[PDB]
Design a binder for this molecule. Sequence first.
Ligand code: HEM
Ligand code: HEM
Ligand code: HEM
Ligand code: HEM
Ligand code: HEM
Ligand SMILES: O=N[O-]
Ligand SMILES: O=N[O-]
Ligand SMILES: O=N[O-]
Ligand SMILES: O=N[O-]
Ligand SMILES: O=N[O-]
Ligand SMILES: [Ca+2]
Ligand SMILES: [Ca+2]
Ligand SMILES: [Ca+2]
Ligand SMILES: [Ca+2]
Ligand SMILES: [Ca+2]
Lengths: 241, 241, 241, 241, 241
Amino acid sequence: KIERGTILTQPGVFGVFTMFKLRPDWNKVPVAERKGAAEEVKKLIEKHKDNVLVDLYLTRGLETNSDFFFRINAYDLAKAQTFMREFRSTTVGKNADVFETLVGVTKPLNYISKDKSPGLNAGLSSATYSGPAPRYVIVIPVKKNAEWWNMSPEERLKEMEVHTTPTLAYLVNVKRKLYHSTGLDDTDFITYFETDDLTAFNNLMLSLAQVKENKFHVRWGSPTTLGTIHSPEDVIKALAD
Amino acid sequence: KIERGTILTQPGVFGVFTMFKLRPDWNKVPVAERKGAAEEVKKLIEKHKDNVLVDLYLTRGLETNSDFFFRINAYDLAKAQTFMREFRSTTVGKNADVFETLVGVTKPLNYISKDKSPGLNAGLSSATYSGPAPRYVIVIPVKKNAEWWNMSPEERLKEMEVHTTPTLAYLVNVKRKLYHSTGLDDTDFITYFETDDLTAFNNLMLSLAQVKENKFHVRWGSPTTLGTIHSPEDVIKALAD
Amino acid sequence: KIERGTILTQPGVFGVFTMFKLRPDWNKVPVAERKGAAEEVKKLIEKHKDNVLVDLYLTRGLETNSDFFFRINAYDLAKAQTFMREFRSTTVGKNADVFETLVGVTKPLNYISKDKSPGLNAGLSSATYSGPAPRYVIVIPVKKNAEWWNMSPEERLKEMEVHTTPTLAYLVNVKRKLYHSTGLDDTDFITYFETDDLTAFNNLMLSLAQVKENKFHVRWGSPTTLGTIHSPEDVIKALAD
Amino acid sequence: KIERGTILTQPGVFGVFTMFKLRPDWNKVPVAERKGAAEEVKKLIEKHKDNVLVDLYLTRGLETNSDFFFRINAYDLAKAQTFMREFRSTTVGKNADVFETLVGVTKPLNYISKDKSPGLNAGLSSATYSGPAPRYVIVIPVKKNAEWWNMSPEERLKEMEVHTTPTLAYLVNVKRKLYHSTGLDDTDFITYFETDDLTAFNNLMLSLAQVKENKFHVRWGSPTTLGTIHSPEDVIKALAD
Amino acid sequence: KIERGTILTQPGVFGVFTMFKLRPDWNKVPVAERKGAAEEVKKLIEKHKDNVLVDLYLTRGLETNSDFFFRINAYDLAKAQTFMREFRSTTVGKNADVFETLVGVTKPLNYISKDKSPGLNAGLSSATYSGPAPRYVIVIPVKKNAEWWNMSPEERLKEMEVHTTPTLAYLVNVKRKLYHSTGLDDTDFITYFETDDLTAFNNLMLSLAQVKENKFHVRWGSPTTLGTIHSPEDVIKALAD
Ligand code: HEM
Ligand code: HEM
Ligand code: HEM
Ligand code: HEM
Ligand code: HEM
Ligand SMILES: O=N[O-]
Ligand SMILES: O=N[O-]
Ligand SMILES: O=N[O-]
Ligand SMILES: O=N[O-]
Ligand SMILES: O=N[O-]
Ligand SMILES: [Ca+2]
Ligand SMILES: [Ca+2]
Ligand SMILES: [Ca+2]
Ligand SMILES: [Ca+2]
Ligand SMILES: [Ca+2]
């Protein structure tokens, strides 16, 4: 069994973000098969109720290299693979090419833990998202250079302490999730955000762009994917027409 | 209501620039459907009269990677997405792939404000385009490095006063708009220009090329998109034949 | 005569990794010919029983630029070429495009030999892979800068003693092979790994990212290819439906 | 009214270089339709007699990303666009994709003028190409870094005095033209050469690679395009069979 | 009249390497029109007996961006262009795309000449290949940065003497030819090697990776193309099934 509330909260959970782009011969799939496409994803998601957690986002109209993207969470990478492999046999699956994939895994806190930084940690755990259900999702893969990794844990802590300080306040505004990827894919992290206030999201990044940590990014985006939040079937219904 | 005068002047407005390139199988769409294309787009813009402001520009013949491109203003990002999504269902939308998308948001003045640089700010707001209606649009994404962002807001202000000084002069010549994107897309800024004097515009960029601020750019173009200003139906009427 | 146990163990063995991505018109091959494509690969591999050693891995659903990939080991690169060349004339072969090829050769120990680093040689050669038959494969090309190659062998040795130290604890966890490539292809090394514990593997790579040697990487990934271990016939069966 | 010798000599002239690549489906336009492609171009050039000056060069067999490319000179970038747009409606235009476009504008001398550098300006102005009519063309876009641009006019002049010293000699061999692009496209300059001696031309670039100015180049080719000079109809005749 | 022993030995000789990749619809050419395509290439080469020297190498199975590549040598670049242009009119030619082209020209010795470096120059000319017919070809484009070219010829000579000292030994083992490209394409040099011993050749690159000269390379491969030597008619016969 796989419960949303738990799997998104736990360490050892594999995140698989996959960005698809619809090929032009999709508008030539017969309106009938295309309308029936949504139910098919919905049943596929149900059929794996117990193997993976599925999220699906709409980026068509906001992104060059994707029309929609999935966020799979799984206790087992192989199972996230099997879902995706089966998704690609779907009617929509057979009509979209993959433009991005990011594999990461969840871990315990490395810096702002109860032990190491109790002060900021109390802040982080007891802060609570306010106001409107988030209409937008942002996914940003982030990779830091060899210099970063070769600083001592004390120095890296200091800098993550600096990361946390202006950002804790945006927790009323923005939901966050951090996956780890070094060794597993071509990035060090995958970050995932949901927010209703894009102006606030901009200011949040500017905050972080402005601290020493930013000096070690060799990837911070590329792509920065920002699309819009819906139910799996709605995304597909919107792709259809 | 979305008044062109107001929406282009206020903060918190989203710009979505989208560069499209026609596929070769557009020449094989029946000269009939193709000529009906312009009206279809015109009608679409009318339907969305009240959700977004639409601009369309012709780059075919001047750009490797776009035949035409839209500028969308919205108070709601989701609404820009809806329009664009509906554009790509159109006859022309169906025969063009996306080659670039930039999402950005309008903000208040950060440096050359009434508070921070009163002298320059006055020259700025009391400067006024003179002469022939501009025929040319240039759009330029700009990203600055971590080192810039790690400068003190005092240091960056001084640099931006340096940016404003030799450029005020070109406000009779060149119209400008600034969008902010850090965290929203793969750029710090989206800059937008209308001019009738390209040689002037060349001198303008050289001016800015020669100051310290330039030292921090990691993207300043790529693509630099210069195309030609027309009414939306006219852009589509030119892609017809 | 080619025994798996010997050829994977010996110096002067050529490795050729080739990532394939299936074209969309494979979904349009008659489902009958697609199911028959597995036996075909299986018979070809029997055909070169004595020419090459063949492994094949499933990356569909986990990788943007491959659905599958081969590892060929041969005593003679020409025989590797024939094999690969004959595969591409196979039914699946005719429906996939090559997206990456790494050519490499197996060499004797340059650094952590018994002569040069006795103590760590002992460690490495004594503790053995325990733990479950590995489900995951990882393939990482690595290339170091000219600064590295210009350091004295005495300096590079010290650096590789520092690489070795943290890895010793993953000897029960992770299986490794190293091919050499400088001058034969666009990388210095091809690294190959098999594991069942991806979190462990992530930890390993973090340990490596954090030593001085990481300072010299100009390539360490791109792509980092991670996918799944199965019998060649099973991989092609997996691609069929 | 547009005389070749005038427009190639004057400031304020727009250059539009466009490198085209024929698609496979051109070898399947019937020979007959393909051979009538040459007159269609020839007739388009005569049609635009008074709007633009057209040059066409053969690159097939010599360049990966072009079979041919145009050089258009205009007093009006808008008129370059129109011509280009109309060429792309041509039989040949319908079977080729654009792969590079460079926009630029002619200016007066910045450095080696009569005022600033009288000695060298004399030497430049009073020198004239000798011997066999040039068979080869080379087009090379150049971009210098923020550091170049932040040097003083005095420092930059010294460096261009350095550029000009070893190159004057090659004016007996090589014809040149200098377009300016900063802010108009993704390059600072577009340089244009005609020669019959490629070994000379090679010695010319090495002369230039060897000086300080070459230290600030961030683009200096890419693509370096070398092809062969013919009348416009002769270029389309060649591409036909 | 073009003699292989002579043209490969003389200065002022144009080299034009071109890497081609067969398109998927080549498997749909009726086998036999395919096998008969070798005859066509053979005839084209004899038709150009007097114009160019032709070589053909098989890379299918070992390279991502080529199935085969040509080496053309000519006294007149134009004639190489005609040859190539006429090859692409060929049956195979109509089914392949070009993925790479390098143009360059033979020159007299710059560094290791009797006058400048008398001893090594003697060692060079009086060195003679033993061992089997080479099976392998490698083609490596090399570009050095502005810092190299800004070194005085004294300093560069020293460095080329350093390149040449550990490499002479490999002349019994490996065959080399050096072409010059600065200004003619997007590389400083094209290097061409024929060997039968690939472990040797790896060791040869590492020798050269480890000298100061390597510090100045900005391109040294990309692509490193290693393929398999045969007669022209044999390479096409091979591409056929
Ligand atoms: C505004 C809400 C945010 C908060 C409260 C926040 C807080 C944190 C905290 C507490 C950590 C340390 C976790 C640990 O070590 O266990 C962390 C790490 C990290 N954060 Fe954020 N962050 C926020 C926004 C962002 C944004 C906008 C980004 C940009 C993409 C980002 C990217 C990252 C990355 C890549 C790491 C891992 C750093 C490392 O590997 O050492 N965060 N963040
Ligand atoms: C010639 C007329 C121009 C004038 C009067 C002008 C003025 C200004 C001013 C006053 C600001 C600061 C606004 C603020 O922070 O609130 C600014 C910002 C900016 N300008 Fe311009 N500018 C001009 C042309 C250009 C050009 C040609 C470019 C090149 C694309 C450019 C790029 C930018 C960028 C990227 C910013 C944001 C800088 C930052 O993030 O701190 N401007 N400009
Ligand atoms: C975890 C188990 C590992 C062990 C026991 C191990 C051990 C070693 C040893 C002993 C050598 C020296 C061999 C020689 O000089 O002959 C070596 C070289 C090398 N290793 Fe690993 N390593 C491990 C994991 C990794 C990982 C995760 C990577 C990164 C992908 C890696 C990359 C490399 C590379 C690129 C070289 C060649 C270094 C050079 O050229 O000088 N190893 N390794
Ligand atoms: C031997 C023939 C050449 C001569 C006589 C020559 C001369 C000059 C002169 C006099 C200038 C300054 C013009 C001015 O500032 O008003 C100049 C500028 C320039 N040249 Fe050449 N040049 C030659 C060949 C080349 C070559 C092979 C290149 C390489 C592509 C090149 C690239 C450029 C560029 C990019 C500029 C503008 C520099 C700047 O913006 O400050 N030139 N050349
Ligand atoms: C082992 C056999 C080799 C020998 C005997 C050899 C010898 C030489 C000599 C004598 C020169 C200078 C010739 C002149 O200046 O006119 C030269 C230049 C050069 N070699 Fe080699 N070489 C060998 C292998 C290689 C290899 C493996 C490479 C790697 C790609 C290479 C790359 C180059 C390049 C790029 C140059 C031109 C340097 C420059 O432009 O100034 N050589 N070689
Ligand atoms: O720490 N936010 O991924
Ligand atoms: O700051 N001009 O967008
Ligand atoms: O470094 N083991 O590939
Ligand atoms: O400066 N030669 O274009
Ligand atoms: O110097 N070998 O090309
Ligand atoms: Ca984006
Ligand atoms: Ca290669
Ligand atoms: Ca990957
Ligand atoms: Ca442009
Ligand atoms: Ca070229």
